[PDB]
Amino acid sequence: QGRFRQNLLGKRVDYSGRSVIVVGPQLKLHQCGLPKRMALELFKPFLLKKMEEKGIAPNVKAARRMLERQRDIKDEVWDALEEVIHGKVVLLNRAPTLHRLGIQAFQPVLVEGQSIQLHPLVCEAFNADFDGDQMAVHVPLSSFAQAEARIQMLSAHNLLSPASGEPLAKPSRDIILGLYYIT
Amino acid sequence: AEPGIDKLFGMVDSKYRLTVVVAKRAQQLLRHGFKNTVLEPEERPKMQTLEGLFDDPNAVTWAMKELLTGRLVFGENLVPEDRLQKEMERLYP
Amino acid sequence: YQAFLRLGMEKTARLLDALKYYGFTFSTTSGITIGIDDAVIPEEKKQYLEEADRKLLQIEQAYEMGFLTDRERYDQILQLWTETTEKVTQAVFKNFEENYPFNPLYVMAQSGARGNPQQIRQLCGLRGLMQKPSGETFEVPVRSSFREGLTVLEYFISSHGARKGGADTALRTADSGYLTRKLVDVTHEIVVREADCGTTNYISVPLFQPDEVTRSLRLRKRADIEAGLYGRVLAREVEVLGVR
Amino acid sequence: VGIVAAQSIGEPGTQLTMRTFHTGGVAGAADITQGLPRVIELFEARRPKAKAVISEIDGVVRIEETEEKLSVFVESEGFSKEYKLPKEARLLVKDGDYVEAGQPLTRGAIDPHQLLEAKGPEAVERYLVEEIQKVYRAQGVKLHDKHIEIVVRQMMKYVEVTDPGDSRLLEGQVLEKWDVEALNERLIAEGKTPVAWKPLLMGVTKSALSTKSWLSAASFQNTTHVLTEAAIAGKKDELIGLKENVILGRLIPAGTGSDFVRFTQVVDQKTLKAIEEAR
Amino acid sequence: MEIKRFGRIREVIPLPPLTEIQVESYRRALQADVPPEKRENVGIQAAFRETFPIEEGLVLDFLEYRLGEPPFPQDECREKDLTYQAPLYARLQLIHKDTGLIKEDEVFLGHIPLMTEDGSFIINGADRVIVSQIHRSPGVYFTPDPARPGRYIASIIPLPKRGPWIDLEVEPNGVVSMKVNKRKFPLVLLLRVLGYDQETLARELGAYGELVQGLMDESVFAMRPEEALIRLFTLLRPGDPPKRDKAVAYVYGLIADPRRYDLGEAGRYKAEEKLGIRLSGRTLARFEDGEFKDEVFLPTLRYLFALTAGVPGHEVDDIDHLGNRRIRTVGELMTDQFRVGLARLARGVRERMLMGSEDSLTPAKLVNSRPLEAAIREFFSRSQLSQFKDETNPLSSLRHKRRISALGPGGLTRERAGFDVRDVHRTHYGRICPVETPEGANIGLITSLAAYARVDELGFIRTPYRRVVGGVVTDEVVYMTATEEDRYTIAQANTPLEGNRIAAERVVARRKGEPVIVSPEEVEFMDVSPKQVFSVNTNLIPFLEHDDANRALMGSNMQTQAVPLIRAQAPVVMTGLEERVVRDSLAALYAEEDGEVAKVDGNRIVVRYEDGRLVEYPLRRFYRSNQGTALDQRPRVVVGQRVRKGDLLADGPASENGFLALGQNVLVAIMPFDGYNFEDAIVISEELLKRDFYTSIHIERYEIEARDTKLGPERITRDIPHLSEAALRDLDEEGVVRIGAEVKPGDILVGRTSDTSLRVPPGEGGIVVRTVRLRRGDPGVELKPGVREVVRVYVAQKRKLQVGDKLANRHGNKGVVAKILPVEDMPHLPDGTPVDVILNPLGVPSRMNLGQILETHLGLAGYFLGQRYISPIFDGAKEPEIKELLAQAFEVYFGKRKGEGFGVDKREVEVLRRAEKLGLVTPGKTPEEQLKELFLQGKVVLYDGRTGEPIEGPIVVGQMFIMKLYHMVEDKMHARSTGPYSLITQQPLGGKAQFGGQRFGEMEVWALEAYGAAHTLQEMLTLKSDDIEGRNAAYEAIIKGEDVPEPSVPESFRVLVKELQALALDVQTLDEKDNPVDIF
Amino acid sequence: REVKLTKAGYERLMQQLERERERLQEISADFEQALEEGDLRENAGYDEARRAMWQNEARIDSLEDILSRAVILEEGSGEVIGLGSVVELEDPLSGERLSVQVVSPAEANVLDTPMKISDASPMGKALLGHRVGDVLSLDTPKGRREFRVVAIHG
């Protein structure tokens, strides 16, 4: 735990989010679910900025107190949150990360429940099944880091495993079951 | 996936090139004011309940859409270094 | 794969999305599930069982007179089952293949869905022989079908493997990507940056494998070949199959 | 790419074992060390379990059965290479057949160094790549050879000095660095002062251990010694390479931070002419 | 409800006390139930006789031992963090060499814990457990030589850990070797020390083993009797005087080293049985008259030349063989540690004689609880053996209550050498459940004991077995030893029977641990029941006989992680042990004797026994579980009700009517949905969450103590340095929060001063239920030093199954809960009644666990027949019988449809139409029969509900038994953005008002590096961590709507530069062309 | 040394390796699935199947091992029971007749027409070296029965 071997072993990061995982049938591979509670807190800063562009609050700290504690989160607030992300995309990460796709980019969208909704196709990617596991979620604050995040880290852009020219968006069990019982 | 992402990769000589290009123009769009676009007339990005996504949606979302059209030009040494923020800040409020 | 190489990235996605939906959609209306009776046991059961029953007694009647050695009786019997089991296997598949081409359990395996032949055996058919604590597989096979009530001991035997399996999976997942670590420690500074190297030094990639059964050059398996040529840079152009 | 190689291979690593019972009359438990362990030894120049002595000499074959220790000669031009293999050893090469340098006399595993001297560098490398795959292949692992190749490449990225010309004959420098000389040896500066170099095979670890940049050495190896000797001379650490450039926290030499695209122009006609209007 | 069990086998003797493993073990260990008159021996007493007779002249021996006056009652100790001990007194007198004195004054030494009714312990406010341990019964054993197939090697190991490891290796080059403390020497030498003379030796020794010349060799040294000892010492590495310092030697006399184990079994066993015969003494002792007699060396070697030659009886002992593997129950473990303190106590009394002030001392002068008490407290709280009592629910604790492990004192089993013991051995049969081991690492190292299987006088787990004369079955049985078992031929309990005689001629039986077929003539014994084969943990699975041992192992442990749901429901199918479980488990309370019901109060139960007496019972309303859960007792009786001795008074945490109920039996319709049940995903109808089916009670114990710093002691009070009143409302009392208050994340429960008030940690809290403080005037509490006072806050809330919920089945099918579709568009049965839970069939194949498929069908009939079933492990119900009853059910489901005035539905047509095309139904038959015949398969028509269009193809349905696990979504819900920072380094760690962002690790980075996300990466290594400048700089830009800051130089960069400068290192930052570069 | 086999015995053994290749290849395939099957750590299917690999991986060795250093016998002529001869034992007192053909330890298979006994087998031990007219016994669990070599053909 010295100085040279410090910048390597990395450490803890901000805007971090994680929780029990579940499949997201309706969800498109182009996106990824995400608990409203999380996204909201995991976006306090950004949110506040947009809160200003709207008569929600007079100034920064104004909006901070607006929701400093509210069991009645204004309906306007929510609509704004979504209005904050828009294009911006976050990142997903399985605990045991060994391959690059151990982390893929997704376009979050308001969802119910307290667990994170994840697309079934990437289940194969991040070695994980829906028995109770839990992924991680980061957010490219840097409008520059946001680029490469959806340009070269977006899921829909990573299909051909670098390990082998074998497809990654390979349909699994259920999908197959049907596609076969029909043909 | 993302809008004509393929058409993009085909315009660049390297995957990573695109990224750096999308990011640089993305900033110039917000810092130097949000009126540097070139496709503002029609087919301009829109929102939902209120198509107010005609002014300030998302940086990159616009950047790429700009490259969608061969209106812009890029390269290694196109325009002088410093002569960058000088000709931009004076041309745009 | 073809789609991607044809239309393009994004487009592929849409396909995938479309598929996903329909897949599920039908997987619900199809009306397929699992029932105790869906694990149809081929009638050949009682047949082969006997065919192998008196069969074993034959080899036994031999050793009882000193015909075979102590070791032969072992390898001999093993051969019986090892193969007699292979029979029942293909047998079951056949019964489903002709009579119930839509039988749940079955459809699964065949389809790119779940289920594996070897596994199916341990259901419709029956598990073969287990292994002893030492290493050498047991002598008394598992004449019981999963679909049927497996006798006590036979279960006690089928556990010798369950414990063993959870043993190796504890010494290989402990180090957690230890390899990658050491591996990265030398590939962490290797990246692309240039415009075509000038080194005209080609590489000799074998299309045929040396000896397997006497000095005879054979054609390497399909996979290996690709793993070595798929996506490369042909040094010297070569017109072979008539194509340039 | 580096990371690639590393990942593609790392992932599998956590799924390779094997070593049981069905054999046992001597010290044999599998016939070699098939499993992940083999991977180690391969990535690390070692002397395998069932090392097969090779014949650096290329000739014919002659055997002598039974009696104490069996022997096989690789006679040819005139001299006869004798190899004493216990009667409990098994070989594939038969009497007469012509053998080449670095050929598997005994059945089993080969030796890195040995193969190197006998046949040569090219042989070793090809041996490695294939030797690896074999493992992952017999495990249902389908990974492109590309990666494996990159790895071994560094296991040879270093050679030793034979003939002086600027540095002692007891040193091992980067293979590329040798060209830095091979060129300035006759081209730039005349007076051809050859520097017979001999590629040295090193296992993955040992390789990194002899890295050029000090920044990197300051991580793994004993910091003290590193900085210490690195100080004496005004060591120049070119900030190229994830690892080292990582410590500094600066933008990694690869990806978007690559020196190739790190500098990009995003001009708009509306202002492009504005640059012309400033002349 | 009706109850039908398919018990074909006549289960003779019922299941013994599932807790007797811990029960008697403690009892017999410390003979206290009966006066010192009933002079037992073993354990406590034996411990005395051991190191009590002390003589240095110091002459003090043991007289009587008594005690057992627990300072505070049970609960008290729990809540007061007190230790449930017991004052230990002792009566002993002293006699001098100079006739006189008989000073016997009550001398006590420390207190000792006691075993709870359930069989647990309350060390310090918490309930722990004393798990058993295995090993190799310290005895004589012969096993082949290491890597040399040559001869063999003998081994002797007499514990405790203070017993030398002696070995006998036959060195071929000549002479035999005796390994001790890493050194070999000519055994001859020692033999001579024993009196063995050359002649008498060889003759009665190598009379058959010509190899004798390998020891009858010494003709130079072996010519000196007693002198030999002098030489033997010379062997000892130390350079001490060759005088009478026969120390090390005497050490192996009759004192401690040689195991002082019971003179008859413990040691004699490995003796008489294996080799030699009678056991002179208790071990290889006898150091009287100068010479030494050891009827141990003669045999150990007599057995050596035996196997190395002829065939005295093939003596090649086996390792793993349980018939040589002893267990370490609580009593042994405890009594063991006890002897330690004793030896440490005697340590003093001895020294307190050399410096003794004449005959003016005896009690205190020679006693001190210090050594004794210290030991005991070390074992019950510092030994890895004792653990946190797993009370996730009734069952859980029970298992952890009788589990066993190898690892321990070390002198039995290590950690890096046991891939051999980890695997199930032949002897484990009915001794150790082969599917009771935990998952992950250590698997096999730890595994509970079988069922009926019980410990004996000394470890050796015996097992019941049916006696049989010829072909007649005896109703008598005896617990056979893992050893003597192989001696006979045992047959299965499957074996058909005709009253009391064997059936078929070709009967199955296990000879010597080997499966064989024997005739009804060589039937020496027979299995008592399929149960004794596995442990309870598994004897709870429905149709085990239809699931793999691997997947079974899963469901087995899963039951232990079950959560005490509020609405308990006994499994539609039961193994018949649920009644016994809840009993020996002590989850519920039974009536002591027969009588009648008195007071049936929700908090107290009173009754009047027929023997003319009245007693009440405390009804622990809602006690805080060790794993945070409910532990209530629902009174299942009413005022005035004749009750029988041992009747269900109030239900346990997960019990219901004397039957275990860890979960609920909900309707299930196994079939693939809209992908909502992908991998292991599990759909669910809102209908269930409506009638509060799957839900539980959770608690949170947040404690706070009033420290006492030297900078002004902290005071508890409503005094808040931030004049906040909007938070002092609920804080009524002077510091503590009101009872029944609704605390929320962030509010204060207790107010500290110096403002270090204990706030509501992240997440939630729930509603307070009970709290207690501890002022200075300690009524009798051991207030930790530096502490002025202490307070506890018991908060709780309801756990209503939501989304992140996960639940599995007794068969091992685990899975999360995806979407919870409402009963509206929920697949329904043609006649209303929609489904409840939708499982995906894909999880059935690969996972060979058909058992479920069975319980379902069986349950499908129990719904209409309105009844529950009990199927023995392997003697359980069979396919035939089921179809019978199930059919009967059809005459109820559809039987009513008829009389009501309605037939089949147009929809039911199309389905059956494809049914026939699927070979499910026999064509030509009438719709009526077609549906019936189809119902018998366990599949029925089913409408979508979403579109009303039924799903073509019947869908097997039934009532499967599931359950929620400990792992909730509460302990997982980290959502951070801006908060605290590492006071030391510079990391976004939270803990209070905010949270802390998960780590990134080099692994994740690498992958990130691969992508080439230079900036995304650099962003994580700086702007989101170390360099605090760019962090805030970034916060501003964001709140200002400006592009995030682009760090020019991470604080790590410049800091290191100068950090090196600090010591020589002239770190010079040059540019692209060897030029200076300003760093700051 | 040098394994001795016959044309018939060869065809059966060589072909054996060919069958095993079609099976073994199926084993690898199954894994390529299980590994992609998701479900971590206990694919009940994974491990059992892994060992199964070692079993085929092993049979592949024993097979190819002998096949590279064996011999071929044409003992159609001669009187003394040699490698390839078909002897016929007839219990003296019983009057019952039998037929068999002992061969090297690499041919054991009770299934063949004449019960092919191992060369190093007790039965294979008492036959080599004697001719038409011999009568000897060995050790038998039920006792010890002698047999007279009726006739040695081919």
Ligand SMILES: [Mg+2]
């Ligand atoms: Mg999981």
